[PDB]
């Protein structure tokens, strides 16, 4: 197929700071990949991002009951939806599985299947944290509401000092350590 | 404390295709199956603590379909510009022989949201056990997608992920062995 | 708990 395509997108965004204490709402319309009209709860009215959306901003702002409906969205829409899924989204905690193996000048600590994404992984060498030659794949999103990451330390593999990988996660009250 | 919830909708022409989803910090809470008019939760457990009337999503897609025709006229019929995807293949666990694992083909930074994805084991297509996600939003308003193939690791089998897009001149294959 | 959709608005003509 070679015929042209035309895409329209709408994104209703809710931004939460310290939970629901501070919320910002955004009603966003996109033609192709270009925002043309937007309602920002900080602005209080629909504003045109590009001239393509200037017809809608004048129309929508004039409709009866519109601004009252949209100026209240942070309470009626954003804050409400936060609480509907709070127990399995904001409060979701999944402890990770940590595996340590080599790859053998290269030694890897593989942290898999955790939620949320916030994690801190450090590498210890006989109680000494080597801060050089530490490479991480970064945080990758598995797409199934779990995360994983690989953090490696390129170190001389010798039968002497004990190597412990330490991870810190909001699911655990105490750090988790795996020893090699 | 800091979170972001996004209700993301789109309609595509001339394919006449639309999707409706909720995103929480980058993960899908649920999407609405336009065909069956059903709410599909990304994790089965989600459907036991929350609910959503799909009827409202179908209404929202019908408005996006009409608005698209209006916006297409506003732009004097300027079409979308294709953007090829970035494909990455990986597993969700360290690979051990004869221990079940899942391959993850991650397709990222592409538009329009139309892709052909096939799992190839030793060059031959495989669909037993495979699954995929809907098109997921992106801050730059392109799309991302996940495909999964559960498999039993072996030294005999190799795998590819063949992705077909309109920004690609030829199919794209991403390999994996061991 | 029931999720609430933000309704899509019809564009000007």
């Amino acid at each position, epitope marked *: 197929d070679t015929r042209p395509r035309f895409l329209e997108q709408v994104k209703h965004e809710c931004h939460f700071f310290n939970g629901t204490e501070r919320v910002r709402f955004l009603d966003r319309y996109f033609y192709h990949q270009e925002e043309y009209v937007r309602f920002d709860s900080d602005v209080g009215e629909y504003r045109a991002v590009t001239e393509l959306g200037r017809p809608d901003a004048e129309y929508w702002n004039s*409709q*009866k009951d519109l601004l009252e409906q949209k100026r209240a969205a942070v309470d009626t829409y954003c804050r409400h939806n936060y609480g509907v899924g709070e127990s399995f989204t904001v409060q979701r905690r999944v402890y990770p599985e940590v595996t340590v193996y080599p790859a053998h000048n290269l030694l890897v600590c593989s942290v898999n299947g955790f939620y949320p994404g916030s994690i801190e992984v450090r590498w210890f060498r006989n109680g000494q944290e080597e801060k050089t030659g530490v490479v991480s794949t970064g945080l990758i999103q598995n797409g199934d509401w779990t995360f994983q990451t690989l953090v490696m330390l390129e170190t001389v593999p010798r039968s002497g000092e004990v190597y412990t990988c330490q991870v810190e996660h909001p699911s655990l009250t105490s750090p988790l350590t795996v020893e090699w | 404390e800091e979170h972001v919830i996004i209700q993301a909708e789109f309609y595509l022409n001339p394919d006449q295709s639309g999707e409706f989803m909720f995103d929480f910090d980058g993960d899908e809470i649920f999407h609405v199956d336009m065909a069956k008019k059903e709410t599909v939760w990304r994790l089965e457990e989600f459907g036991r603590f929350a609910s959503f009337e799909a009827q409202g999503a179908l209404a929202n897609i019908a408005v996006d379909k009409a608005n698209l025709e209006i916006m297409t006229k506003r732009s004097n019929y300027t079409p979308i510009t294709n953007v090829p995807p970035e494909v990455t293949v990986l597993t969700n666990s360290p690979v051990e022989l004869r221990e079940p694992n899942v391959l993850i083909c991650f397709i990222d930074k592409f538009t329009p949201p139309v892709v052909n994805v096939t799992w190839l084991r030793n060059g031959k297509p495989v669909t037993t056990g495979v699954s995929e996600t809907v098109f997921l939003p992106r801050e730059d308003h392109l799309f991302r997608k996940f495909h999964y193939l559960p498999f039993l690791p072996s030294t005999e089998d190799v795998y590819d992920c063949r992705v077909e897009h309109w920004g690609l001149d030829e199919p794209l294959l991403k390999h994996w062995e061991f | 708990g029931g999720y609430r*959709a933000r309704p899509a608005k019809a564009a000007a003509t």
Partner: T-cell receptor
Amino acid sequence: AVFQTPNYHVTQVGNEVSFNCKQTLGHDTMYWYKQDSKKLLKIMFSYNNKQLIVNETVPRRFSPQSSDKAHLNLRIKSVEPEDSAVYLCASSLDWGVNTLYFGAGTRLSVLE
Amino acid sequence: GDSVTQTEGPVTLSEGTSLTVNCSYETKQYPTLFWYVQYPGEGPQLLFKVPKANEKGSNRGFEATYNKEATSFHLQKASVQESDSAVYYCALSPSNTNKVVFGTGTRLQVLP
């Protein structure tokens, strides 16, 4: 506002009737309601941007029509004596929870 | 099964009399509540609405609190005027979609 025609109409059982409604509020959603002698106000049809949303009427006796989001027309193919009522047209900003804005009503009398 | 139950039959009061129109609702979803008024010769018209579970609505000297514990929305006014003669409709609608259920509608007649 919300305008309906006709204001009154009388016809015989088995005839066809056509009501029409326009709203100038800019709203995407319009409604037809039936109001009876005992002040029962129940919904018949709901349209959002020329698409059917709600239908609580009997399977095939009625024929609503919306060429535009500002117009909502109702058509009874064959009237029964039980169709004698006041028919009110309403609008709302969109299909979510909203205030309803009504018209003056159409008073329809169906006689044998 | 959303349902609304209002005061039965017509109410007749001398002007200056307090007023109470009892309204009980029943729903498995979280609703917003409304009071509509229908003056003679006109269509229905919003009196006030209360979206939040335990809040108060007021207009034209009328007042009703959305009692979620009792599932009630009783309308009250301390001194009704002759201009208040009309039909009053209590209604609810779920907060995820406009699906308004109206009560039976109580006609109020204020006598001078």
